Design a protein around this ligand. Sequence first.
Ligand SMILES: [Cl-]
Ligand SMILES: [Cl-]
Ligand SMILES: [Cl-]
Ligand SMILES: [Cl-]
Ligand SMILES: [Cl-]
Ligand SMILES: [Cl-]
Ligand SMILES: [Cl-]
Ligand SMILES: [Cl-]
Lengths: 477, 454, 485, 483
Amino acid sequence: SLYAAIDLGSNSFHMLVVREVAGSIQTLTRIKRKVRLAAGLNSENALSNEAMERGWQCLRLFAERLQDIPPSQIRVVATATLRLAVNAGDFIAKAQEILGCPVQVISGEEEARLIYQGVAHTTGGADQRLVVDIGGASTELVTGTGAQTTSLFSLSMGCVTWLERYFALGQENFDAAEKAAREVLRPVADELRYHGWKVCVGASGTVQALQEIMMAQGMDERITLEKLQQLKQRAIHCGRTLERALVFPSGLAILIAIFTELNIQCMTLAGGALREGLVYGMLHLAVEQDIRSRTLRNIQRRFMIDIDQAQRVAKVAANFFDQVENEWHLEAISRDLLISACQLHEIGLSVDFKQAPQHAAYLVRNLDLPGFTPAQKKLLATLLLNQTNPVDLSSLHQQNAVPPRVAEQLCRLLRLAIIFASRRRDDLVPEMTLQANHELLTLTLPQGWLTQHPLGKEIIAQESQWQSYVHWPLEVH
Amino acid sequence: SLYAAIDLGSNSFHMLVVREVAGSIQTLTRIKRKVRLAAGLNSENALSNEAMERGWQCLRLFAERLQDIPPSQIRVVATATLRLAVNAGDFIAKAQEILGCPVQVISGEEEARLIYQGVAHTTGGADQRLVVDIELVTGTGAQTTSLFSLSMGCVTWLELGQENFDAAEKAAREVLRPVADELRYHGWKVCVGASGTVQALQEIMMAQGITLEKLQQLKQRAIHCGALVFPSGLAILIAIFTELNIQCMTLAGGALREGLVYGMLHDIRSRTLRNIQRRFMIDIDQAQRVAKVAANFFDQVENEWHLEAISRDLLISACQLHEIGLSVDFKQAPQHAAYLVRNLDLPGFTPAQKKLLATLLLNQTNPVDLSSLHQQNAVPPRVAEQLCRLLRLAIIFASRRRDDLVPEMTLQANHELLTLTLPQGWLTQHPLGKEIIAQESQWQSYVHWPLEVH
Amino acid sequence: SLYAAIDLGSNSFHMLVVREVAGSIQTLTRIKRKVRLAAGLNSENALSNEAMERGWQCLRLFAERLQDIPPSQIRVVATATLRLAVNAGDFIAKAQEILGCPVQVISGEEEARLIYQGVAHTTGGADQRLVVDIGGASTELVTGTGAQTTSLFSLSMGCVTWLERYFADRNLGQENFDAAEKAAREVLRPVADELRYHGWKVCVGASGTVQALQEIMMAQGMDERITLEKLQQLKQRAIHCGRLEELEIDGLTLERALVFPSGLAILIAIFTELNIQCMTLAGGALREGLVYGMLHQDIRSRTLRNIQRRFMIDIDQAQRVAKVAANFFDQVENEWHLEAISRDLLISACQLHEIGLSVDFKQAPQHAAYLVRNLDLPGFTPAQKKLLATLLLNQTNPVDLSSLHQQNAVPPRVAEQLCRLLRLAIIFASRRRDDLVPEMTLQANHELLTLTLPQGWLTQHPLGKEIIAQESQWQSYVHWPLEVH
Amino acid sequence: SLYAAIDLGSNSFHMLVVRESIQTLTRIKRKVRLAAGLNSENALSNEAMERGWQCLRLFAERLQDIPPSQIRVVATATLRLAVNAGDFIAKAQEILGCPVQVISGEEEARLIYQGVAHTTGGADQRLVVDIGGASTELVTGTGAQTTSLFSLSMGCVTWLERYFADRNLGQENFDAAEKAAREVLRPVADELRYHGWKVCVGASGTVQALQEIMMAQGMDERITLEKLQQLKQRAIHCGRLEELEIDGLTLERALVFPSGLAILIAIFTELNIQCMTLAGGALREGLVYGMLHLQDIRSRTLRNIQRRFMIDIDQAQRVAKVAANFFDQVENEWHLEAISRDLLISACQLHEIGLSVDFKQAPQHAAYLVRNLDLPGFTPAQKKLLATLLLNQTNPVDLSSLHQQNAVPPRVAEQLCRLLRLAIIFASRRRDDLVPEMTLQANHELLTLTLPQGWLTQHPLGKEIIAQESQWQSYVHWPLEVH
Ligand SMILES: [Cl-]
Ligand SMILES: [Cl-]
Ligand SMILES: [Cl-]
Ligand SMILES: [Cl-]
Ligand SMILES: [Cl-]
Ligand SMILES: [Cl-]
Ligand SMILES: [Cl-]
Ligand SMILES: [Cl-]
């Protein structure tokens, strides 16, 4: 059965259809039609006939998409413009006759709660987080732990209104909007660093925008203060994406104000926003301790991945990681990437046994993996591509999620792990010592294990050979 | 659960591990190890001990790969070489302690029986069929009517100017001339080949872009030249062809080891199709919904377009899988769909047929790529287009996912013109539909498919 | 003007046509036609008029290709099969007049001498070398230094003869291998002392068996270095297949496979008797030998210079950048444990790094790689050629590790290090004047480079500063830490 | 040696550095904003004064080792106006080791015409349109002597302000600009139209947006007002300005694209312009060729390239000889006009370029070189077809690439390709005295070639190569008979 969320906003009407798969949800259609509803709104604070007719025609099309979707599974909501129209009930009234179902105007705060609920369902990392959505109407800031909102503030700052207001681009023109936006940030520095966060995550177009310029210029996806300073000092350089660009400097001035005010170290892009909030709310899902686990679990059902074999390889790889962790100085996100790889590593077998690593990497590049950044997906995919056969460093280093040396190391851990869990018995997995000395791995097998496992011996000899072609010394006794 | 078939042959030991998932089985490993058992015979019909050592060493590896498989789901068998050895009992004895389980020596007829069961459970096409292994068999629907072992084999004939070819050919036609009689009586709708040799030939068929025409024209790719076993196997078959008056040969999707697996288990196409839907969580009501529309469309245009019942079933198959790309992701679903179909093993469809499903699926929407429709051998180019059209339009009018919301339509074909008639007023009441149908119209026309809809 | 070389061989007639461009050679046509002349030999060693007909007909084509080239600039040679056939004098005379020129039967020794000349003009590395060429009927071993042979031998063993004696019954077992190797050691043994006396710094090989090895190793993902270990692994593989007709080795083509076991056996026997540590594939052979003699020390440098001439590369800029690169290498060669091979490859990159400019400035790295990838570069192996190309592809802009690492020639970490030196070296030659290159020190601390500039040099050059800053960013996106003040 | 050219604009400073025929080494644009130092009384402020100076010290570090004799600097736009400008120009002159001169807009337009005149192919009798962001230059001329010259007041940036005070491509704000610009050049209009031109070429941003839009959308390369208004209609249908998108348009382009789209179609109408190719040079190129003190471009290009890649020139003429003769014998039957004769000869002069890389896959190398080389006197479309002819000079034909070009119709790309293969083959002996006498006759898709009596029988390798060439053509349905 189908679920739908419609967001009637300022410039565009957004409709996201979606479908229930096992205990999951996948996008079916995701649609945006440019109504220009805030443009038809005059100095009497009412909305011109032309804009309400534009908006209504759009919804006549959306209405065609909702037929025999039970309205229990639909939620339509509206935002700033329809919040502040003196007209609004005239539009909403016909809107609800066109669609077969209610329109709910929502407070700027209920938009924030919804947005949070949307990143919370779609974002990996720590439960304690601080969400930043810089929109044109309101720039919300919310703190929370695992789907409970501790603080929730919808503050009135636009990328449009900090734009027109303070830009008719100086190094000091940001300066105005900066302190301007900092005045609103001045009271809540108290309560936002009160509850704090261990991870910071952005949600909307200006955030999305910055993500895409970093991607474009060759940086990773970590938004740091020093990277926005490449811009601000190059942002009086020009001095005065197409649509994104126009509204960019104000949003950028707001972000460079928020990083400095709150001493946010790092921001990365949420995988969720309002429309996901609405449609996850309708799912009635117990909220998970770790989102990535739900994702992996659902993919495993969908593609009938053998879970016991999956779990067995994760255990071996986790054990190997822990034993080389100090010598290789691996951090924890690498461990979760490695395990996540192991949970998915046989998905290529869904398609066919022969070229399964090719199939694995195809599926993982292209699957929607909530809880995983785009950069992390590619890393997982290329790890899966290199799970066996001659190492292909060319395709391995097609990732930017972890440092290259570390990509190689997680590759090595995954390849070995698959080999020593390969018998598909939880009692056939031997006791082993793994010791790393710089680029050397030494694996100590149970005495007599090799001479007693002639297929194991063959496979480890081959693996040693392959790692050596790529100058990874492997010694297994 | 996981099942294994092992075939102890003369030259090689073969293994097949298979997993039973949803409505069928999928291959896990398919392994061949060269033990050269036959080479260790001394003319006293005894096996060298070095040969026994090789075979036991190969089994030691197989046996490691088979732990967590229970003996009742394994079948190990042994072909002619261990049939003729006074030694055999000694090898088989250590082998059964190495493996977890018994080794069953089997007669050639029984091997031909099991082989045939293997082609039966894995091969699309009709029921009655004539199998050729360079051992020939006829049967209908998993029941072997006739059976054979003839006086030719792979290596046997070898020991290319037209002399040396027809030195094999007519001497092969000699071998099969007296036995070719009782065959035509039993009859065959479909002629198939199971041996690897046949696969020498299928690789060329879908490599250049099985008939006696292409056989002689291949035999003349040989004559003009002036691989170990190939020229023998060729001369036999094109002799097996003429003397049996056989129209065309396809390749079976199974052999001995498939026979052993299915014999342990409690329309091939239908099984595959539903198997795939299960595995990739395709919405089966929607697939059926699209198929009834497309088949209904098909029926209305098939008289004008001269369409074969065979084309009908390719079209319906395409509709059964058309949403498989969505199991990956919605954005570029047509391309994931072509990817999955291209790489799945699909029992009941030839390589040309699978290649045609893929491109039908890739072109189920968006700007049409005619070249893509064209690189495929299951159907003429024009037919691939005709069925692509029906599939794209069937998908549009079923996009609601509800049986009673798909409109009553009539479809008329005048050469390349399709004329779709919707219920009166339908277009008026469906603004998004209007929009989709105009965009499809625009797309069909970029590629010279003229489409009126009323 | 044109030069041409005909090799009338046992299985094939080979032609090479060639042109003197700049100060080196450029190949125009390279032609092999199978006449299978030895196939028309008989038990009495006379050539079937069938075979002899195929031969003349080929030479009739070689002839038309040959017209309007002076006989001064042509050499036609016949080898083992035509020095066998009693019949042979008859094929020559007609062939000699089907072509416009003489057909010279050569001894196995003159065959050896031209082979060594072929390799010495095309092969980089230590110029004091051992050359092995295992042919059908004979095996040349020549010992030499930089075009001067110090010892030379043509011995009666070869893949075709050895397949017949020791692989009598078509079995690939340890029995027949042991015999084949034992006989070859006994052929070779008497000349071993003279070969070791003159010694060699590098062993390089030449014919089908060596080529089969390059193609096998390439296919299986190994480097291009032939070692005893790899030969033993192939041998155990051959023994596993057990019958010549069942030989299957990944990388081993059909027509190499027929003569592969016997050659493999001879080469292992050669590898053992002389204790060869490593054998690589020579740049050239008999037909190169024929050509370089009609033309009348460091192969790499001749190649680099000739390419610079052909593509109008600025040679002063090239040397400038190479000097900066070579000196960066030395300051860091310690901490990064870098060998002499790397230094040469780094410098060679520097000599060619600007060759993409000869196409156009916008995409010049992309063009440089295309040119280097596809150019013939005598003195460089295909693995080295591909490395150079990829250092050039990455000489500027955001580092692309994916393209950097499709390279087999150095170890992966060394490919990066060399790349980093090439990028910096280029940056500090950017103004194209030897006087304008600062005094610098570069210390390497594991993955981090520290570069110290003359006092306030950064403050004085707002461009150099700007670029350097960009290069430290580029390096940082790949996690190469670079400090410059 | 190396030459430099610096252009001091109100918006940006522009460098062009070149090695000597000549080739670009660096092409630089720095952002200055000298228009924002000009106040109400029209003197230049000391904020931007330092900015352009800070920019000039970067250009300065680049231009050492270039003697000032081989440098040329000019200042335009904002620098004329400002009464303060002399102050700037003075310290700028100290920063660079060389003089800066202030040039007018009409001298600006002469150096512009000089730029296209030395670089651009096609009829030496031309109309040049260049739309700055503020000033629009239009110049009639015949072959490096200019018949007429104009610099008007309209530009992308200006028309984005005055006649575009929002983001609505609705015809009301659009056609006010298509008028107020059309009346701007309506006074000068008549003197251009009677001076006349055989060809119209353009050189500003607006014109590069169209060349790019056209190669991306697969159209042929002549810009028409009909083509201009498929983009007007896929502009108009785009509602607001920020929402604008078409195939082949880029970041900085669409920024001011619509305001220039109006100006070009206004120039297209009032002047009644039939089509437009993209000019090969401009102001900075003018400056550069003024320092070189140097007949027809293409032949100058072909020589230069043949020298860089050491192409055997004799063999190149020898092949172009045969292909010329083959062209003339099929010329009437096949609808072959001189434009596409030159293209055949140009392909021949270069046909051996890939051999400068390596002989094995030379055709593939020749296409790569020609595809990426800068070839003054050939449009992008013509270059692209030259590449594919060279790719297909031998070896099984590939039609897709032969039909991948904007230059000459998919039909003729083949007929040309056919004649090149034939000319190469019979020139293949590298000697004048060995080319055989030949007749070549076409009838629809049949070529029939008569070699001397007994030639074939007595050229087995020829006979073999010819046979293989008959098969390759037939594969692609090109019937060929030869006797
Ligand atoms: Cl794979
Ligand atoms: Cl990486
Ligand atoms: Cl077997
Ligand atoms: Cl029948
Ligand atoms: Cl030595
Ligand atoms: Cl290796
Ligand atoms: Cl050595
Ligand atoms: Cl003038």
